Structure formats: C-alpha cells, structure tokens
Structure 1
Amino acid sequence: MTIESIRVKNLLSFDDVILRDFRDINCIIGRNNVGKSNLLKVIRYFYAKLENKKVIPLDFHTNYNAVGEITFTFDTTRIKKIVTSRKNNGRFHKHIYNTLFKSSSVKLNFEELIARKNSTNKSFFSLTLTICKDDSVMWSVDDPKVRSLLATLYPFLYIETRHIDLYDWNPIWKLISNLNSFNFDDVDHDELVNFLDEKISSRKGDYKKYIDRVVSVIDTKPYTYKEKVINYIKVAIKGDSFGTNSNKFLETLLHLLITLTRTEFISPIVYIDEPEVGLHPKLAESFVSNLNKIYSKFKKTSELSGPGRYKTPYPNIFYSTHSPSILKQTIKLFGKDQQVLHFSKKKDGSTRVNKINSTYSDERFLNIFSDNEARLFFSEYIVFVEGATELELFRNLSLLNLYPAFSLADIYDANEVILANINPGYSKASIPFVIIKDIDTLIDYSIKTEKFSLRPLFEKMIKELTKEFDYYDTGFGRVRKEIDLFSDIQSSTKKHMDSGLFFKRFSLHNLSSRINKVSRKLNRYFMTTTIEGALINEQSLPYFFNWIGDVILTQMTINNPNPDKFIEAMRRRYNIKSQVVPLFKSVFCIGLNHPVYSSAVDKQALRIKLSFLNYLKRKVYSDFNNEKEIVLALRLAFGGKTETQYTLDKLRKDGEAELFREKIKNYKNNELFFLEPQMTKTSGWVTTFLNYTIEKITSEESDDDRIRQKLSFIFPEIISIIEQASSSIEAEESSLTG
C-alpha cells in the first residue's frame, strides 16, 4: 500500500474521522460537499504544509477545543525492503535510510532487529500536524528532511475536471519529469549544450553562432533541472501538442502514471474531482474500462508473467463521482480492488464517513450488475421488495403525489441471494432501508394436517435474534418470551372452516404484529397480506366495483365495423334478459380505440351496459354468502392467497376448495371474461386501480389532508407502510440534514 490511514480531529466539518483500508480504486459518493470538499481541503492543506508552503490554517469544527490534528500514516514497508538490502549502496537509498528508518532502528537490540527482519513485518511512519488556537502549527517530527522526503516518496496529484485546462498541459510535464528517475545532473548542462550544438548544427558552430547571438540578446535565468528534463522529454517525443478532450486529458494522465510508476519506488496518490463531468455515459464507462485495461495489462500475478509485467504497487486513486455509470463500471471491472466511501452528516452536523460493501462473491451478480443496481448507492432510503406488483404500487405517480415524503425512497426488487449480497446491514452502511416481505416466508400452513410448519428463514431469524444465549442478563427478557412463543407456534394446531379458507378463532394480524415488533430491529417489515391482498380489502370493495363499472362503461367498445346493423342483429337474436351474458360477449369487447357510434347504437349499448351491471351486482351478492367470500374470491382470481395463505394453483394441485374454485372458474368464463386478461399479476391492473381510485376520491373531496385520510381509510395497510417509511425518512433526514 501507500497510505495506511488519515485521521482528522476537530477541523472544518470533521469531529473525529479516520479513513483506512485504502484500496487501489477509491470511489467517493454521497450528498454534495457534506465533507467531500472538506476532505479534499484537509489533504491539500496537509500536503501544502508538508512542503513548507505558507497556506492559511483551517478552521475549527468547534471552538471548545484548543487544537485540530491531521495524522497521516505512511506505509514504508517496501521502501525499507528497498534500502535495507546490501546491493543498493546508492546515495539516495543511503539518505532514505539515514532519514526515515534511522532513530527507530538504533534503539532496537539485536534480537528485535532480527525478529523484525525475518518476520513478514509491515512498517509504518506516522506524522501528525497540529493546529493550535493561535494559528501555530506543530509537527510530531521536527526534522524538515523527513517531511520533504515523505513528500517526495508519496506525491499527491489533484486533477479537477470542471476547471481542467485543455491547452495547459504543464502538470503532465511536471509529473513525467519527476516520476521516472533519470539523473541528468551528472550530464553537465555545459557539456550538454556543447554536445547538442555540436550535433544539431548544420555547420558546426552555425547553429551555435545563432544561439550565441540570441543569448547575448536575451537575458535568461539559469535553467532549472525540471525545465531541463521537460525540454529533454518533449523534444525527444514526436509531439508536444495533443467533453471528450477532458476525457482524453484524464485518460492520458492515468496511463502515464500507471505506466511510469512500474520502475520506480515512488507511489503517488491521485485525487480526481468529478471525472464524469461533461461526459456521455458511454464515455465515462469507456474511461473506466480504459483505466482498468491499463491497470491489468501491467499486472503480474502467479499466472501472468513475462517481460512487461511488474509487481510494483500501483498508485492509490481516489475520485469523487455523482454518476451511477462510473460507479457501476468500477465495481464491475475492479472486483475486490476498489472501495466505496459514503459521506453523510451526523446529529451535530459533523461529517460521517462509511465504507459500503461493493465486493460480491457471486460472479453472476457482478455480471448482471447494471445501472439500476448501481443507482441504489446514491439512495437516501431503500424499500426492498419481492415482486413486480410492489414496484407497481409504491411507484404510482398519483399515490406519491399525495405523500411527498415517500418520494425520496427508492423501491427495488431484491431476490434472496441479491438481498444477501447487497443489503446495507451486511455492508454496515448508513443508508437506511426496510425489507418488505410477506408473512408466508416464515410459516406455511397445511390444511390436511391443520398444522403450521416453520420455514428455514424463520429459523435463521431466530438464530440471529438469540444472541442472548451467550451473554448476561438485562432488560431483554420480553424478547426471549416472544421467541419462546415463536417456538410454540410450531407445536400448535389450528382448525379451519369452509374446507380451509378461513380461521375459526385465530387472527394472523396479531401474529404479524408480534413478528413486526420483534423484527423491526433487524429492519424487516412483514406485511400481513400480499400487495394484491392489501388492495382488495373489504373497505375498498365499492371503489373496486366502481372500477369494474368504468372498465365496462368507458374502456369497452363494439366489435363490428357497422355498429347499427350489428347491434340490431344481436338485439334480435339474443334476449336482453335471459341471454345477457352471450349478448354482452358478442357485442362488447375491451379495446384501446373507441370508434364513434350512432346515437341509437350508443343508447342501446348504454342500456345493455346498465342491465349487465345490475345483473352482475345481483349475482355477486347472491352467489357469495358474505363480503369476506367476495374479497377472498377476488384476491384469488388475481393470484392472491387466502387467510390460510393458499394460491389458486396451490389449491388446484392439492385439491381443496373445489366448490370455490369452480365458482371462480364459472365467473371468469361467463361474467368476467372481459377482465380475464387483467387477472394476471403482470397485467398492470394495480396501476389502473390506483389511478381510478385516487382520481375518484379527489373528485369526492377537495382537501389534501382529508384526501390522505380517505386513502388511509381505504388502504389501511399500504398507507400504514408508506406512513411508517415516511416517518423513518423524516427521522433520518433530520439525522442527516437536521
């Protein structure tokens, strides 16, 4: 490595911040300038004070402390390996030993020196800069030679892309002339001038006479060594000159650094500010791809070996980005060699830095990694879900219009493996999230045996929550009692009614409440019923019926190019009363396009529609004994589950509820034939349902608080989830912005 740690105490927006475990690529994300620019300012100030530049001291986070400290730990293991060896008796190695490693090995005895040599040791050098209240600066190492040498060995290069200069390439030369160590001091500039003017002269002297005349005319400063080397290099190069222009500038910068550092022991640290600014997304992805290609082409491992491959450590690259494309490409290409840093705000307003897990052991997840997955890294609050219906509901524009707080939460569907290797808890990240799952993932009910059985994920949750089996006593006893009740859930048997459709005495709502209360500390919320079960509730049945009326009255058209003769012929052939179902089947059909019909045809269609609506209401209220049976039938017909958590396919395979299944089949094949294509889970009936419902209630009432109250009454559970999420969002927003 190059830098082991950076620690800032009581400076700018930092209270006490320690950054370590630096990888080869460090991606910095978060809310803008909540400490990003402050960290950059801290690093720049430390490296400016390292080279004895007169720069203004930084401000204190709170004036109730006398000083602020910046501690840099350099990893000098490789340099110790470089110099302690006998072969390299050069002047530079000798000076490096006398400066950095002496006064720390002198104190040691022979045994400890041997132990340090022989062991697989790591050597560190800690330098602390302290700013007092009266602007004075104190170093923990009082030798300026140490500071200058540390500045040389670990140079800091800052590249800003917004204010980049596409025609000023001076940093390129200042970088290349320094990186590769050519000793032109031994080559006299007097000898070099005589040498070059000996050669390039057309006549030996003619060029020299011209240059001597110029020099006698022009009053020039003596050449500095860096100027000499820059002249050398860019004269020998076959070219001095060189949105996409900034990309090329940055890409050549990184290529030069990575290529040139392979032969040197100097390991620079490069910080890039918004590399993607002014870049097409494909251009940013290609920039990261080119950087990775340069990185891996020069990489030597146990497999890749040969001339042209080195084991020299690579420079440490920080870059602060705001685009998911850069982050996605980094994560995909760099694997285990990158780190993602998240910047947020504490309670007292100070900056908080976290490391988000971006390394995945599942290669499939790395390959399928796309823009949507990389977007979650910028999320303020995540609502992980399980199916597409949840995404359809929680993303509904009309619903989120009435709840602006929930508009800041990103809803993402996560599989069990995806959730296992993405979730913030395992990533120890401070991006708050909630995992919304159904209660069926823990307990499965058997009608034949009338018994609940426990799912493995419930056992895993119990094992995670039973951490008190290895510890002492405190106020956690109620949790143990709840876990005991969860254990007793297994042995209990419960009787069913109507061949396994309803529970005699048991309320799954109470068990769901207990599970949610217990597991809220694990950030998982368990909804009592499915989303399609939550929308189809007893309170919203009128509006649901209204919706059906709408899809009959407005979304239906006539299946004939000649409405008049068609409607007359099927009025004649099929009776309005005794044959309403086939008449409606032949006459009406669902169609996006609504051709204009005649007044008589429109009146006849309206009359048939009203008659069919009355018939359907009568038959719905007649065939089903109670409203609960109606709700259950509608839920199953759309793919839902009963109070016993059984799907229509599950019942068909098992063979229970034959009468209810046949009734639903009769309704779908006779009365609800038009709504059959919308019976599927992916039909998008949720969006139309919610849009019509919210528009209708807005027509009913004109107050925003009142409309929220009505929506809460209609969908108690979905609105409860939304309100809990919004309250948590506001709490964590006060945790960040408050």
Structure 2
Amino acid sequence: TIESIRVKNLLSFDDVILRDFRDINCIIGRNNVGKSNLLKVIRYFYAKLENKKVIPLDFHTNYNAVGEITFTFDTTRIKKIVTSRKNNGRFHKHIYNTLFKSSSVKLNFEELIARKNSTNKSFFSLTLTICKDDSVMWSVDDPKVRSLLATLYPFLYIETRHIDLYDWNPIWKLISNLNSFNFDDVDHDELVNFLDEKISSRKGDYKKYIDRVVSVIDTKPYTYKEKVINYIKVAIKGDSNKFLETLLHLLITLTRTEFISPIVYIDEPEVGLHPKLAESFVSNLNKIYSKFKKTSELSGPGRYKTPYPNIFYSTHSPSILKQTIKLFGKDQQVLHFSKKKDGSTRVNKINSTYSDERFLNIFSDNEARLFFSEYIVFVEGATELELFRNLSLLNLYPAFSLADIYDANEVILANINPGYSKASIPFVIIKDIDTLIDYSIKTEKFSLRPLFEKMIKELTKEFDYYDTGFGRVRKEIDLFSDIQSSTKKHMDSGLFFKRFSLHNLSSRINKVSRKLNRYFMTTTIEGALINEQSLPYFFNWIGDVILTQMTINNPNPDKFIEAMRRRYNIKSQVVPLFKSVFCIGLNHPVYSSAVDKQALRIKLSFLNYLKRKVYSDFNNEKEIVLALRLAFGGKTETQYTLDKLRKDGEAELFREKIKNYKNNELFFLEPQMTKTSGWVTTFLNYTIEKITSEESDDDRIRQKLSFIFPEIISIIEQASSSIEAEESSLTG
C-alpha cells in the first residue's frame, strides 16, 4: 500500500511526486515516454530492493550529482497485525523486529499510548540514491528491511502487447508466493509409494521404474517453488484478454487471506480488443472487486474487509476509462502526464468523481473523450456544435481541429469541473451575454444574473496588499456594479439602444474574464453568422435554394409553364405562380433548353423581386439583419427573442412583417428557420465555397472569413494561439 512515489533528477523527471493512490489508478496522456520512464523507475527500485545487478538510471541533467527515488509505504495494517498479542509467529516477530523496532525502543512510555487509538497511520519512507559514479545507496543500511518491504509489497508488471500465452510465469509466481500451506512436511517416498500402489501389476513395480528414471536424469534437487508449482499443476484439472483477466482474478482471490499487498502495473490492456471486450474486462474487474467486499449489512462467508491491491492502468481507449469512472466511482483516479516548457514530465489528477448520479449513469464516449484532449471548448447549444465542427471551416485553420467542442450547460460544467484540470487540459467556456445581464421593456432597467454576481464576488480581490498593475480591477468591478442603472433608452419599439453599445461592454467583460477561461459573445450564435457584411452571401445562399432545392412539380414542365403563364400574370401574380410551380424535391431533372431558360428567367425575376421588397420594406439596411436573426431563433440587442417579444407584446409591426415574410414570401425557407435544421452547416459550406472560388490564396480566404465573421474567427484564432502556446507540452 504505497502512498507516495518521488523521483528527482532521473530520466525525464526533475521533481515529480505521486500521492493519493487508489485501487484502480488509471494513467492517460500523450507523453508515452513519461509512462515508460515511470515504469522503468519503479522496476529499477524493485530490482535494487532484491539486490539485482542492473544498469543505473540516467540523470535528467548532469549538473546534479544525486538521483533520488523515494517510496512511502502505508504500514498501518501490518503494524496492527504484528502488534496484537495473539500473533506470536516467526514471520510476525521478524516483521516486528526490523520495521517497527527502531521507532519503539527509543521512546518513553507515553508516545506509544497515543498510537493505539485506531485512528493514526504509520508511514515508512525508503530512499534510493544514485551517485555520479554509478554507486547506489539507501537511507537505511539493512538488507533485511529492504527484503521484507519487497516481500510485503511486491510489484507485478503485466505487458499485453508482448505477452506469451504458453508461459504462465506470473500465475505460478503468484501461486507459489501467495499460499498458507507448508509443503516441507510432504514425504516424497510416501507419495511415490502411493503412486506405485495405485498402478501395480505386482507389489513394488513402479518404484524401480522411478528409481531408474531418477538415476538416469539425476540433476539438481527441486526447489520449494518448483515443488509447490508441480503440486498445484497435478492438483488442478487444467493448465490476451482472457489470460490477463484470469491472472487478475487469481491475484484478487489469493489476496483475500494474506496480508501481502501487491502492486499491479498493466500496460495497454486494450491492444487488439473490441470496445465491448474492454468494457467487459472492466466490468469483470469491478464484479470481482465488489464480490469480496463486505459493508455493514453485507456480510457472510466469501466476503473480506482486506484492502485491495493497487492496480495501475496505461490506457489509450476511452472505453476502459469510461467504464472505470462509471463502475468504481470514488475508488479510482486519472493521472495525466503531459510535459513542461523546457521538457519534463508532469503528473496531474483529472477529476473523475461526480456528485451527480445522473451524470455518472449517462456517462458516455464523449465525456471519456474529453479526457484525451489538449483543448476543450465548452458551448451551450447544438448550433455551436454545428458551427465549430464544420469540416469546411476546420481545413482552413489546421490548429482548431486539435480542439474538441463539447456541449454542456452549467450543471454539466460543474460536474466536470474543468478548473481542477487547468494546466493539463486548457479549456474555454463560450457563453452569451444574456447569461450575465437581462433587460425588460416594461421596466426599462438592466438586471444582473446570479452568475455575473458570483463572478464579481470571485473577482473581488479583498484581503490583499498594494501591488502595481492590480489597481484597475477594483474600478472595473465598481463599473460592472453600477451599470445596473435604469438610464438606457431604447428606440425602434425596444429593439436597439439609443446610446448604449453592447460591443464595448462585451469586450470589457471578455477582458476581465479571460483569467477565468470564459468568453462571452456580444449576441447569440446566430448573430455572428447573420450580420451586415454577410448580407450579400446570405442572399446568394437564398438564391442557391431557389436554384437548387425547389423544382417543378408537374411531370411535363413546358405545358405546365405555358398554362401558368396564360393563366397567371407574370408580373402582378408572380408570387402565386412561383408558389404553384416550384415545390420541394431532392431530384433535379434536366428539361429542354427553352424550359431551362424560362425557369432561369423566372428564378432571377423572383430573386430580384424579393431583393427589391426587402430593400423597400426596411430602409436602414440594418433592420433586415435583425429580422433574419430573429427568424432563426436569434436575439436583439435588447436580449429579446421572437417568442419573448410575442409574449411581451413588443414590436407588433415587426412581428407582423416577420409573419408576412414567413407565410407569404419566404415560405420555402420555413423548415430551415428553426434550430437543429442544419442551415448553419449549409450556409458555412456555401460561403466557404464561394470565397474559395473568388479568392485563390488560402490567406486571402482566411482574411475574407475574418472580415465576414469577426467573432467566430476571433475565437478560432484565440483558441489556436492558446493551443500553439502549449503545443510543445501537450504533444508526445
């Protein structure tokens, strides 16, 4: 039961300390060299415990003449076992003659009385020092202590990528070491006599054959381990994933009546395994873990209170991590290694325990994927998932693809708690301004949400001295407090602001909240897409629909077009003709040349008519942007949606105009005017294709995208800069 492993100036470790070990400690990270170096350090320490001639480990830097490996063992169970009066055994005395002997005979008759309260824990520290001249020495100069520590807390290494099925060395080693039977009392002559009696044509026939065989193969006598292995093999009736699972089950079962506390390290348990196989492996491990556990009402034979051995995993599969988190719960941890700026392995504990049972139960592959990440962008909304996972946009920015987009609300963020793992997995939480401040038309006054007040309270730097530079934070906090005034006049029936600008407030909030890994947008997600500079392209997109997604319904196009022209007027009744001619159809049949020309002319006339009507009904050239924004579930600068405006009875004429366009003119876009309709993906793809057709160089394309989409490109560039700043750290 180790509690601390410290490595200083060896391999890739400068000063690395590992603590709070649990049963199912899992190791993840892109720095495989760090995992290999840690395994090498552990194996070297345990080899030097057993006095094996091995090559000393290399130093991290040659400007240090000392390389230290420190192991701390929790010798609390063993001390309690050997202290009890009714444990007068040779091995128990040997344990309470080398480990718990120097700390007891040198104390008075008062210190020990405080060690029998069944509440304190005893720690044993052993340090291995490698000198510059390839000389190794220990803190305690007693080989018996080291041998006893190795026996009591053995280390097992299991490799699955290179495993030999024919050889079962770990199984037989565990069987020989973990036993409670004495095999020295077995009489070999008696066993041979019994075997001869079992198969005897005459009295004493197999004895002479055995004697001849022994004489003709006379070699060194069997050792105790060989004898017990042979006895087990003749006693039992039978000799990748299945092998490892059987070995783990055997080790768990054996360590139920023994005070030996093994340490198990398993490297890549999922190589060549189906995801269901890995999940079943973790499930079987949890089942064997829980079968031998007794808690209060759970009792009876077959259940033990013996502490379980520590198991270490090195997994690159999200399935194993997901099952470990879901099943074990509080009895597991995740260690992310990564690297440092100059180059040095780290170890950080990632949050794996959740106080919400719903989140633990609905835990899925995405949540386990978040731990195998180098940058997470947390968004509230599926529209952001559509926008930031757009393939046509990520190819132009080959640095934001390394970031993973996760949709999470406040509860999911609180459960995940990204702030716990900040230097290992950088994250940004993208939210909207509406989550900080709110506005009311009836009562013309700003209001502050509890999230904003909590952020301010977190940013109130009280209990602080005077330092240069940290003087404007208080002024910013005071301004964010006093912006709660009711002096904010709104024009255009409560849609815009007469003097106030949310851009400056959003910029100030982003500047002050950069340190809290939060980015607040000026408007909703549809605001960054439907803006003034995107009006042409967006319009073209609409035209694309009129040219692509709407086809003639009649099987004969020429006759139907002629009938409509002779029946409906081409100019005054153009809208009814367009509605009655073109419908929804995936297929795009090719018509005659004259029919194609007529259809193209009709489509161009309809596009011109809609453009003219849009430019005539609205005059400021900006109200159309707000109309389109509210059409696709957007918000105004007053933080009001179309539904909220309808419920509040504000901008009745605007709602009437929106209804007229929806039910009269832009009826074909009605299916796409809702969220989760995929209009974002289509619009981004069309815009990027058009820009690629226009601009040749990719830099020109990126500049044009920055011009048309300032906020999206700003966020992408900020995330890319954050990733590239720590690129040398979060990369193997």
Q: Would the alpha carbon gap of residues 257 and 693 (structure 1) be closer, same or farther in structure 2, given more than 3 Å must change?
A: same
1:28 counterpart = 2:22: no
Q: Would the alpha carbon gap of residues 624 and 165 (structure 1) be closer, same or farther in structure 2, given more than 3 Å must change?
A: same
- Deviation, structure 1 residue 633: 0.3
Distance 1:390 1:505 in 2: 30
- Deviation, structure 1 residue 186: 3.9
- Deviation, structure 1 residue 195: 5.9
Distance 2:320 2:202 in 1: 57
Q: For residues 644-690 of structure 1, what are the alpha-carbon distances to aligned partners after superposition, in whole Å with 9 as ceiling and x for unaligned?
A: 11110000111101001100110111110011111011111011101
Distance 1:200 1:86 in 2: 50
Q: Secondary structure at the match of 2:15?
A: strand
Q: Secondary structure at the match of 2:8?
A: strand
| 8 Å Cα contact 1:201-1:208 kept in structure 2 | no
Q: Would the alpha carbon gap of residues 54 and 523 (structure 1) be closer, same or farther in structure 2, given more than 3 Å must change?
A: same
Q: Would the alpha carbon gap of residues 263 and 545 (structure 1) be closer, same or farther in structure 2, given more than 3 Å must change?
A: same
Q: Would the alpha carbon gap of residues 474 and 194 (structure 1) be closer, same or farther in structure 2, given more than 3 Å must change?
A: farther
Distance 2:730 2:335 in 1: 16
Distance 1:537 1:178 in 2: 74
Partner of 1:158: 157
| 8 Å Cα contact 1:23-1:316 kept in structure 2 | yes
Q: Would the alpha carbon gap of residues 202 and 100 (structure 1) be closer, same or farther in structure 2, given more than 3 Å must change?
A: farther
Q: Would the alpha carbon gap of residues 64 and 189 (structure 1) be closer, same or farther in structure 2, given more than 3 Å must change?
A: farther
Q: Secondary structure at the match of 1:105?
A: helix
| 8 Å Cα contact 2:506-2:521 kept in structure 1 | yes
| 8 Å Cα contact 2:160-2:268 kept in structure 1 | yes
Distance 2:191 2:49 in 1: 34
Q: For residues 281-327 of structure 1, what are the alpha-carbon distances to aligned partners after superposition, in whole Å with 9 as ceiling and x for unaligned?
A: 00000000011011101111113111110000111000100010110
Distance 1:178 1:119 in 2: 30
Distance 2:196 2:229 in 1: 18
Q: Would the alpha carbon gap of residues 159 and 201 (structure 1) be closer, same or farther in structure 2, given more than 3 Å must change?
A: farther
- Deviation, structure 1 residue 357: 0.7
Q: Would the alpha carbon gap of residues 231 and 349 (structure 1) be closer, same or farther in structure 2, given more than 3 Å must change?
A: same
Q: Would the alpha carbon gap of residues 685 and 506 (structure 1) be closer, same or farther in structure 2, given more than 3 Å must change?
A: same
Pairing of 1:6-17 with structure 2 (within 5 A): 6-17=5-16
1:549 counterpart = 2:563: no
- Deviation, structure 1 residue 426: 3.5
Q: Secondary structure at the match of 2:458?
A: helix
- Deviation, structure 1 residue 600: 2.7
Partner of 2:680: 686
Q: Would the alpha carbon gap of residues 189 and 14 (structure 1) be closer, same or farther in structure 2, given more than 3 Å must change?
A: farther
Q: Secondary structure at the match of 2:395?
A: helix
| 8 Å Cα contact 1:355-1:429 kept in structure 2 | no
Q: Would the alpha carbon gap of residues 203 and 84 (structure 1) be closer, same or farther in structure 2, given more than 3 Å must change?
A: farther
Distance 1:311 1:507 in 2: 65
| 8 Å Cα contact 2:338-2:729 kept in structure 1 | no
Q: For residues 529-555 of structure 1, what are the alpha-carbon distances to aligned partners after superposition, in whole Å with 9 as ceiling and x for unaligned?
A: 112110011111111111111111122
Which 5+ residue runs of structure 2 have no aligned equivalent?
none
- Deviation, structure 1 residue 182: 1.9
Distance 1:735 1:153 in 2: 38
Partner of 1:3: 2
Partner of 2:168: 169
Q: For residues 382-431 of structure 1, what are the alpha-carbon distances to aligned partners after superposition, in whole Å with 9 as ceiling and x for unaligned?
A: 01100001011111111111100111000000111000111320345620
Distance 2:202 2:288 in 1: 45
- Deviation, structure 1 residue 597: 2.1
Of stretches 29-38 and 563-572 in structure 1, the one that deviates more from structure 2 is 563-572
- Deviation, structure 1 residue 564: 2.4
- Deviation, structure 1 residue 223: 0.6
| 8 Å Cα contact 1:9-1:17 kept in structure 2 | yes
Q: Secondary structure at the match of 1:86?
A: coil
Partner of 1:442: 436
| 8 Å Cα contact 1:564-1:601 kept in structure 2 | yes
Of stretches 563-572 and 621-630 in structure 1, the one that deviates more from structure 2 is 563-572
Of stretches 127-136 and 96-105 in structure 1, the one that deviates more from structure 2 is 96-105
- Deviation, structure 1 residue 492: 4.0
Q: Secondary structure at the match of 1:35?
A: helix
1:343 counterpart = 2:342: no
Distance 1:30 1:44 in 2: 21
- Deviation, structure 1 residue 181: 2.9
Q: For residues 484-531 of structure 1, what are the alpha-carbon distances to aligned partners after superposition, in whole Å with 9 as ceiling and x for unaligned?
A: 011101134301001101110111000001100111110001111112
Q: Would the alpha carbon gap of residues 202 and 421 (structure 1) be closer, same or farther in structure 2, given more than 3 Å must change?
A: farther
Higher helix content, 1 or 2: 1
Q: 2:253 aligns with which of 259, 263, 275?
A: 259
Q: Would the alpha carbon gap of residues 313 and 428 (structure 1) be closer, same or farther in structure 2, given more than 3 Å must change?
A: farther
- Deviation, structure 1 residue 591: 2.1
Of stretches 231-240 and 422-431 in structure 1, the one that deviates more from structure 2 is 422-431
Q: For residues 8-44 of structure 1, what are the alpha-carbon distances to aligned partners after superposition, in whole Å with 9 as ceiling and x for unaligned?
A: 0000000100001001101100004140111001001
Distance 2:8 2:14 in 1: 5
Distance 1:441 1:213 in 2: 91
- Deviation, structure 1 residue 198: 5.8
- Deviation, structure 1 residue 730: 0.4
- Deviation, structure 1 residue 470: 6.3
Q: Secondary structure at the match of 2:634?
A: coil
- Deviation, structure 1 residue 206: 2.2
Distance 2:113 2:199 in 1: 57
Q: Would the alpha carbon gap of residues 524 and 177 (structure 1) be closer, same or farther in structure 2, given more than 3 Å must change?
A: same
| 8 Å Cα contact 1:34-1:344 kept in structure 2 | no
Q: Would the alpha carbon gap of residues 356 and 506 (structure 1) be closer, same or farther in structure 2, given more than 3 Å must change?
A: same
- Deviation, structure 1 residue 598: 2.5
| 8 Å Cα contact 1:272-1:320 kept in structure 2 | yes
| 8 Å Cα contact 2:359-2:412 kept in structure 1 | yes
| 8 Å Cα contact 1:442-1:455 kept in structure 2 | yes
- Deviation, structure 1 residue 147: 0.5
Q: 2:269 aligns with which of 272, 275, 282?
A: 275
- Deviation, structure 1 residue 599: 2.5
- Deviation, structure 1 residue 604: 1.8
| 8 Å Cα contact 1:381-1:410 kept in structure 2 | yes
| 8 Å Cα contact 2:157-2:265 kept in structure 1 | yes
| 8 Å Cα contact 1:356-1:429 kept in structure 2 | no
Of stretches 113-122 and 196-205 in structure 1, the one that deviates more from structure 2 is 196-205
Distance 1:202 1:260 in 2: 41
Distance 2:457 2:204 in 1: 90
Distance 1:171 1:210 in 2: 34
Q: Would the alpha carbon gap of residues 145 and 543 (structure 1) be closer, same or farther in structure 2, given more than 3 Å must change?
A: same
Q: Would the alpha carbon gap of residues 659 and 202 (structure 1) be closer, same or farther in structure 2, given more than 3 Å must change?
A: farther
Q: For residues 449-502 of structure 1, what are the alpha-carbon distances to aligned partners after superposition, in whole Å with 9 as ceiling and x for unaligned?
A: 111111111111112112425666664221111110111011343010011011
Q: Would the alpha carbon gap of residues 198 and 148 (structure 1) be closer, same or farther in structure 2, given more than 3 Å must change?
A: farther
| 8 Å Cα contact 1:34-1:345 kept in structure 2 | no
Distance 2:165 2:311 in 1: 21
| 8 Å Cα contact 1:131-1:138 kept in structure 2 | yes
Distance 1:200 1:32 in 2: 62
Q: Would the alpha carbon gap of residues 184 and 250 (structure 1) be closer, same or farther in structure 2, given more than 3 Å must change?
A: same
Q: For residues 353-374 of structure 1, what are the alpha-carbon distances to aligned partners after superposition, in whole Å with 9 as ceiling and x for unaligned?
A: 1000100010000011011110
Q: Secondary structure at the match of 1:122?
A: coil
Q: 1:533 aligns with which of 527, 531, 549?
A: 527
Distance 1:594 1:560 in 2: 13
Of stretches 77-86 and 198-207 in structure 1, the one that deviates more from structure 2 is 198-207
| 8 Å Cα contact 2:635-2:642 kept in structure 1 | yes
Pairing of 1:654-733 with structure 2 (within 5 A): 654-733=648-727
Q: Secondary structure at the match of 2:57?
A: coil
Q: Would the alpha carbon gap of residues 189 and 460 (structure 1) be closer, same or farther in structure 2, given more than 3 Å must change?
A: farther
| 8 Å Cα contact 1:356-1:428 kept in structure 2 | no
Q: 2:571 aligns with which of 567, 577, 584?
A: 577
Partner of 1:426: 420
Pairing of 1:456-495 with structure 2 (within 5 A): 456-469=450-463, 475-495=469-489
Distance 1:114 1:632 in 2: 78
Which 5+ residue runs of structure 1 have no aligned equivalent?
241-245
| 8 Å Cα contact 1:25-1:318 kept in structure 2 | yes
| 8 Å Cα contact 1:23-1:337 kept in structure 2 | yes
Q: Would the alpha carbon gap of residues 399 and 467 (structure 1) be closer, same or farther in structure 2, given more than 3 Å must change?
A: same
Q: Would the alpha carbon gap of residues 113 and 196 (structure 1) be closer, same or farther in structure 2, given more than 3 Å must change?
A: farther
Q: Would the alpha carbon gap of residues 188 and 32 (structure 1) be closer, same or farther in structure 2, given more than 3 Å must change?
A: farther
| 8 Å Cα contact 2:30-2:731 kept in structure 1 | no
